[PDB]
Design a protein around this ligand. Sequence first.
Ligand code: HEM
Ligand code: HEM
Lengths: 146, 141
Amino acid sequence: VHLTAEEKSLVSGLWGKVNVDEVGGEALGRLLIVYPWTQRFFDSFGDLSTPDAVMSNAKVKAHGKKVLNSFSDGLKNLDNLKGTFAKLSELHCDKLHVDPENFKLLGNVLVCVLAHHFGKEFTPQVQAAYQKVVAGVANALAHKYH
Amino acid sequence: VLSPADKTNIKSTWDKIGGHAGDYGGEALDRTFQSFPTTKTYFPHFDLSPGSAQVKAHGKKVADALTTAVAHLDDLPGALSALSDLHAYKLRVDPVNFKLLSHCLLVTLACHHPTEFTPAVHASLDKFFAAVSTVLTSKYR
Ligand code: HEM
Ligand code: HEM
């Protein structure tokens, strides 16, 4: 992560407007739906078998929230991502055993849910910066495998 | 696979995109160049600045192609076999590239058409992009 001033202004500019109860929910939902294998890590979460089932399931809304808050945390600390995620990184790797390729993919669906939400304001400009931040996070999380 | 729900979601979206395909193709290229710069690698003869006519012109082509496909969903391999040879034999393209453009093409659709970007559709297209990509990569496999 580089993220030149312009890029920063553009990222945090949009993120002011993002409904955090909403987006965690939709991003995570969407993951389970477009990549079904990801479901295996959420048995604890109950019925995910249909798309409306996942759309509607509470335990999912409630994480979505926790995941997106942590991504908030990484936005403050863009500098030292590595530090900010290390503890989380040890969980996804050790106790969870999530292959990192799936970090990418959450990251991308989050780019999706944004785009859907922001219409034009999501310019190629804007999406490039998030691609960056997203890729940062996914690495920062992969760390305990490096 | 590509079941008949799928195929429905796909047709219906492409019906609604109709006469704008040609610009969406423009834009999805944009975004790709801009978010994944490694790809501009393949367009050294391109004016790869933002509104350029080089970009725009292909875009129309990349989108005609996808239109064509949407029409042969049953015979994707017949449909795109010449392009298969193009990208595999002549342009020698990294398969990783397709993952990336596919993602920007999805995006551009989510920007323009939030309302028919439900998760169920999102899944269907993804899946469509993955199939088209498998096809253009098939000469490696
Ligand atoms: C951008 C990537 C990710 C971020 C920012 C992220 C963030 C988080 C956070 C904050 C928690 C813990 C919530 C707490 O404080 O209790 C967590 C837990 C978890 N993550 Fe993620 N995660 C990421 C990717 C993934 C992916 C791709 C998967 C699986 C495919 C995954 C599976 C889980 C599971 C199973 C838990 C805990 C489950 C439970 O408490 O029942 N994570 N992740
Ligand atoms: C769904 C995916 C793709 C489709 C539908 C597609 C479609 C096409 C079409 C229609 C052409 C124009 C054929 C002509 O030369 O008149 C073309 C050429 C080409 N494609 Fe793509 N392509 C796709 C993916 C890629 C990817 C991932 C790349 C590279 C990253 C790529 C790079 C190129 C290049 C360099 C050419 C020739 C450029 C020119 O001289 O005009 N294609 N492709």
